[PDB]
Amino acid sequence: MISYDNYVTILDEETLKAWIAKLEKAPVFAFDTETDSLDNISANLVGLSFAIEPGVAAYIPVAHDYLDAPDQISRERALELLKPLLEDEKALKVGQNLKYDRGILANYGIELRGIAFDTMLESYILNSVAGRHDMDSLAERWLKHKTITFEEIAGKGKNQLTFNQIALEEAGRYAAEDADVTLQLHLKMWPDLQKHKGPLNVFENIEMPLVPVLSRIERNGVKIDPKVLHNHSEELTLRLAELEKKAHEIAGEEFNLSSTKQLQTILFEKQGIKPLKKTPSTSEEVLEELALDYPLPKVILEYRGLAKLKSTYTDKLPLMINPKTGRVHTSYHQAVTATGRLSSTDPNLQNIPVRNEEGRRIRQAFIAPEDYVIVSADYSQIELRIMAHLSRDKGLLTAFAEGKDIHRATAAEVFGLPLETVTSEQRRSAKAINFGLIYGMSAFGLARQLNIPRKEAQKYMDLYFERYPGVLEYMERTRAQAKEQGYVETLDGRRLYLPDIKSSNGARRAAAERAAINAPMQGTAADIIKRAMIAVDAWLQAEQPRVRMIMQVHDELVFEVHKDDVDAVAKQIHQLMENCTRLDVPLLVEVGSGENWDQAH
Ligand SMILES: [Zn+2]
Numbered sequence: 001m002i003s004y005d006n007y008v009t010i011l012d013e014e015t016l017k018a019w020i021a022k023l024e025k026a027p028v029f030a031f032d033t034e035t036d037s038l039d040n041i042s043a044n045l046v047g048l049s050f051a052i053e054p055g056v057a058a059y060i061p062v063a064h065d066y067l068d069a070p071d072q073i074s075r076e077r078a079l080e081l082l083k084p085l086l087e088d089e090k091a092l093k094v095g096q097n098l099k100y101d102r103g104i105l106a107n108y109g110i111e112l113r114g115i116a117f118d119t120m121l122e123s124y125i126l127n128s129v130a131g132r133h134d135m136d137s138l139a140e141r142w143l144k145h146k147t148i149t150f151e152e153i154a155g156k157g158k159n160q161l162t163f164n165q166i167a168l169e170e171a172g173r174y175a176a177e178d179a180d181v182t183l184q185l186h187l188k189m190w191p192d193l194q195k196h197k198g199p200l201n202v203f204e205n206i207e208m209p210l211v212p213v214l215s216r217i218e219r220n221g222v223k224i225d226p227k228v229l230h231n232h233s234e235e236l237t238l239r240l241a242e243l244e245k246k247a248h249e250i251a252g253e254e255f256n257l258s259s260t261k262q263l264q265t266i267l268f269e270k271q272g273i274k275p276l277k278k279t280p281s282t283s284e285e286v287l288e289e290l291a292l293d294y295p296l297p298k299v300i301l302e303y304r305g306l307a308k309l310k311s312t313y314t315d316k317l318p319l320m321i322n323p324k325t326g327r328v329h330t331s332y333h334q335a336v337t338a339t340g341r342l343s344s345t346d347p348n349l350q351n352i353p354v355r356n357e358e359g360r361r362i363r364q365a366f367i368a369p370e371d372y373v374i375v376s377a378d379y380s381q382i383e384l385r386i387m388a389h390l391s392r393d394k395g396l397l398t399a400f401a402e403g404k405d406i407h408r409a410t411a412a413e414v415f416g417l418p419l420e421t422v423t424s425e426q427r428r429s430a431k432a433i434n435f436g437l438i439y440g441m442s443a444f445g446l447a448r449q450l451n452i453p454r455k456e457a458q459k460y461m462d463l464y465f466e467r468y469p470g471v472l473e474y475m476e477r478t479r480a481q482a483k484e485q486g487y488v489e490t491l492d493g494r495r496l497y498l499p500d501i502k503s504s505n506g507a508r509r510a511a512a513e514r515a516a517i518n519a520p521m522q523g524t525a526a527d528i529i530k531r532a533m534i535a536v537d538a539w540l541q542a543e544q545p546r547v548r549m550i551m552q553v554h555d556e557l558v559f560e561v562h563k564d565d566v567d568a569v570a571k572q573i574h575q576l577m578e579n580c581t582r583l584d585v586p587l588l589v590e591v592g593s594g595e596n597w598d599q600a601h
């Protein structure tokens with residue numbers, strides 16, 4: 001148990017100063033902030049904790065205000081004394097999710113520098129799939145130590161306390177332990193992170209430098225117009241009512257729009273093969289087949305999609321506007337995906353329909369402030385260009401080299417016809433093949449996406465490998481080393497460990513073999529995107545132009561640029577993204593602008 005004897009609670013300047021002096025001569029020190037909220041932009045600093053050595057840590061309360069709380073160094077005095085150390089790039093800090101901390105300090109005009117180690121990221125790079133990368137999971141895995149939980153000091157449910165209401169010493173136990181455990185975790189993981197120059201490279205030049213740029217992107221937020229969203233909601237209520245009527249009218253009586261309950265009894269009872277359509281889904285969608293002739297499945301389909309969209313973005317988004325900035329602040333997660341791509345929540349920007357009109361209207365609500373424009377910079381099929389390189393295929397490499405549509409180029413070879421004559425159906429077939437290879441899909445899988453018979457799909461795949469031999473050789477070689485070493489790598493050294501690579505279980509080893517082929521391309525795209533963000537952010541920080549990087553979704557970076565600077569800025573973003581990342585993969589950045597994200601997109 002952690003008691004009040006473990007860590008000191010600093011309540012006077014003289015003592016704070018004695019610690020600042022020791023901190024100033026330490027090789028590295030753990031740092032942590034405690035606040036009255038999870039919302040970064042509006043949270044208030046309540047206290048700070050440091051750890052100079054395992055077992056030697058302190059908690060400095062500055063804003064606890066429960067009834068009769070003892071005197072504390074003021075938030076302002078503590079920060080002016082701590083500011084020099086915190087802003088000194090030479091004073092190296094360790095922490096668990098330093099992104100949060102860097103931002104809190106920014107609420108006071110302090111730029112945390114020396115952001116050298118983040119134990120969450122050390123863990124993530126050591127093995128992204130070892131398990132959760134939060135401090136409590138980490139402490140238990142590497143230290144066989146269970147940490148004091150927030151719920152243990154604050155309580156649960158609606159009556160949970162906010163940090164400023166917790167007694168000084170209890171808050172101390174929690175806060176000082178964080179700092180202490182964090183430093184211990186670093187001492188155990190940092191040495192390990194050196195057994196290999198690949199992960200070390202990614203951790204050092206990709207992951208750590210990205211910490212402060214994500215903080216800045218998140219705190220910038222994005223301007224969302226709530227009127228547009230509201231009218232879209234009202235219209236969707238009318239449209240959903242209308243569709244409900246159109247459905248009742250196509251059949252007879254009233255009924256819910258749920259399959260395997262009300263639909264199979266109507267749809268199949270009036271002709272159609274018995275199997276219902278599961279919302280599995282993108283592999284055999286019963287309702288959409290019928291759609292080509294049967295009108296009911298069509299309106300039920302278009303109904304559900306609209307209902308999901310309304311409650312997920314039309315009704316939720318306006319509620320996400322922060323009263324303090326008047327903008328929305330999405331959460332980017334840097335240590336969650338297995339391949340290294342950034343994920344996103346509240347809102348999850350990647351789930352906004354891309355090829356659909358309603359998705360387009362959602363994006364029309366992401367607007368640029370007065371005298372500014374939204375700019376979208378996209379890496380054209382970066383994953384496919386990465387495959388051309390990894391397969392050393394002169395065919396693909398040349399297609400990209402001369403600017404041809406790889407899907408039409410691919411079709412012209414697989415079907416053997418001039419590029420000008422390739423039809424829309426042939427382009428659609430080549431495209432399914434191409435993107436199917438990335439996700440390592442089976443000839444049968446391809447068939448299920450192309451709506452053609454088995455072995456006909458096999459026919460297309462054999463023709464492809466004959467024309468593009470380098471891709472089969474890459475695929476075989478990759479599944480090989482995957483079994484030889486138990487993991488695959490990205491161009492920068494990032495690793496995805498594949499434990500079921502020999503699973504014996506068919507399905508699991510199947511998944512592990514698809515992952516083997518895929519991860520290197522997706523992880524590499526991820527690494528390129530992060531390097532571009534770091535690069536563009538560095539220019540932004542150095543030159544201070546009239547632009548803000550507000551979003552990162554899929555393979556695009558979105559900015560707010562002053563209307564009178566768009567041309568020079570576009571030239572610059574463009575050169576940085578395709579000339580300041582990797583010079584080996586043939587990259588192309590499509591830059592576009594408009595009044596909203598939909599127009600620039
Ligand atoms: Zn904490």
